[PDB]
Design a protein around this ligand. Structure first.
Ligand SMILES: *C(=O)[C@@H](NC(=O)Cc1ccccc1)[C@@H]1N[C@@H](C(=O)O)C(C)(C)S1
Length: 456
């Protein structure tokens, strides 16, 4: 009763839907299944499959400290290279530990430069089609080769006691960022409060200026922002940890972007295995893991510094050549599904899902998807709960402004496992219905998935 369920949805919402028994060649439900749509975070299903095929479940991201030169009486005569590898889980502590290892190895002083090497990747750290306005948000932090603590930092914004005075910013001292406030404090119930925005404006070298207005508040406003220049940020963290460990140097911090032969590895950190990281990625919809993996796929397949284009080409090739899926006119722009350039039909995603199901004993893939009513993004999915399908749906969600997708597997009343793709976009509610905007979605899903479960 798809057309009927559609009437639950806001005016003019666009659904493309396909439901098909695992291993079958004809769908049970086909509603605009050939139509292209924005996949949002369901793109991560493709990223995970191509990643397992190209890199394997035991791949680890790695970061090293390398020396180029001889060490004479504790002095490195040459450069220290910190070679980053797009590990999305690297932490400040890891940098601190690698420096401790460097110190313990006998290096007290560097007669030379400190190089922040990001040559594993090239070109922009932002995928084509990502909205500019989200670039300062942590969910869209540029997934650079140099990541520390997810390239996200937090700040506290305090209103001035005196209306009219500048709001002021508190930030922890260890974050190598530079904050400026041009934020005017407003009285509690100002009319100027209506159209005066509070904005963040990023500058070079991880400078951020806050502008606009802030109404007086009793508690400081917590804000979190994305680092725009990972290389500089990681360099500053490295500089701080070197100084704390008493290692001095004569040169400066420089970027090394061109491919080069590695020095001797004196310290290293490897991530958890790729299967573990893909699990986090699929359970929680981790954009940063998805996108670091995506550019790593292209680097590994083509032996070139990883770029968005190389990743797109690689994923297409892997799907066709290793999984037997020709994605045709599909557009793959990134790994996370954030890009509004991504475009794929349910019927194409269905081929991917059918491949995964067929090879699931090899891939151990379906166990990584959120299980409705249990974990990940589906722990609390109201539509699926009310449908009676908790514990019976393993599926990847995808959500952007106006896009509410699901893609995965359902075990039905008969025990038949079915793959399904729900691509719902163009979803918008009347301006006076905003913080209720999700009830039509919930009503739609409750009915749809009960139907699928009960009738198959
Ligand atoms: C993929 O769809 C991702 N979407 C976004 O990051 C956009 C977004 C949405 C809401 C708040 C902030 C940013 C991830 N997938 C969705 C999803 O699976 O529904 C999440 C909300 C889990 S983020």
């Amino acid at each position: 009763n798809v057309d009927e369920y559609i009437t639950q949805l806001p005016a003019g919402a666009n659904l493309a839907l396909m439901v098909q028994k695992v291993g079958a060649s004809a769908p049970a439900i086909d509603y605009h299944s050939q139509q292209m749509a924005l996949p949002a975070s369901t793109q991560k299903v493709i990223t995970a499959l191509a990643a397992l095929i190209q890199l394997g479940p035991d791949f680890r991201f790695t970061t090293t400290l390398e020396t180029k030169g001889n060490v004479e009486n504790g002095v490195l005569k040459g450069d220290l290279v910190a070679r980053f590898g797009a590990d999305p889980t690297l932490k400040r502590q890891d940098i601190r530990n690698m420096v401790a290892t460097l110190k313990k190895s006998g290096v007290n002083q560097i007669d030379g430069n400190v190089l922040i090497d990001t040559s594993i990747f090239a070109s922009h750290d932002k995928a084509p089609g990502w909205p500019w306005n989200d670039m300062t948000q942590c969910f869209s932090a540029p997934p650079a080769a140099a990541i520390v603590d997810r390239n996200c930092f937090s700040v506290s914004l305090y209103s001035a006691p005196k209306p009219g005075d500048m709001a002021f910013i508190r930030v922890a001292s260890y974050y190598p960022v530079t904050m400026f406030s041009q934020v005017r404090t407003l009285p509690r119930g100002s009319a100027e409060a209506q159209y005066c925005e509070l904005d963040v404006v990023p500058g070079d070298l991880n400078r951020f200026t806050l502008t606009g207005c802030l109404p007086q508040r009793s508690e400081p406003l917590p804000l979190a922002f994305a680092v725009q220049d990972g290389a500089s940020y990681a360099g500053a963290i490295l500089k701080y940890e070197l100084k704390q460990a008493g290692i001095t140097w004569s040169g400066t911090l420089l970027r090394q972007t061109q491919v080069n032969e590695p020095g001797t590895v004196v310290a290293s950190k490897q991530s958890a295995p790729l299967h573990d990281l893909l699990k986090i990625m699929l359970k929680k919809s981790d954009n940063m893991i998805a996108d670091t993996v995506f550019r790593m796929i292209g680097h590994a397949r083509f032996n070139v510094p990883g770029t968005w284009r190389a990743g797109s080409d690689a994923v297409r090739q892997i799907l066709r050549q290793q999984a037997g899926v020709d994605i045709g006119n599909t557009i793959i722009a990134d790994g996370s599904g954030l890009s509004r350039h991504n475009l794929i039909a349910p019927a194409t995603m269905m081929q991917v899902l059918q491949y995964i199901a067929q090879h699931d004993n090899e891939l151990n893939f379906i166990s990584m998807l959120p299980l409705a009513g249990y974990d990940g993004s589906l722990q609390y999915r109201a539509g699926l709960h009310q449908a009676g399908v908790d514990g019976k749906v393993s599926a990847k969600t995808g959500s952007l402004q106006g896009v509410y997708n699901l893609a995965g597997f359902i075990t039905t009343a008969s025990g038949q496992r079915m793959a399904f793709v729900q691509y719902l976009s163009g979803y918008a509610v009347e301006p006076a219905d905003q913080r209720n905007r999700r009830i039509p979605l919930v009503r739609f899903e409750s009915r749809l998935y009960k139907d699928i479960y009960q009738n198959n």
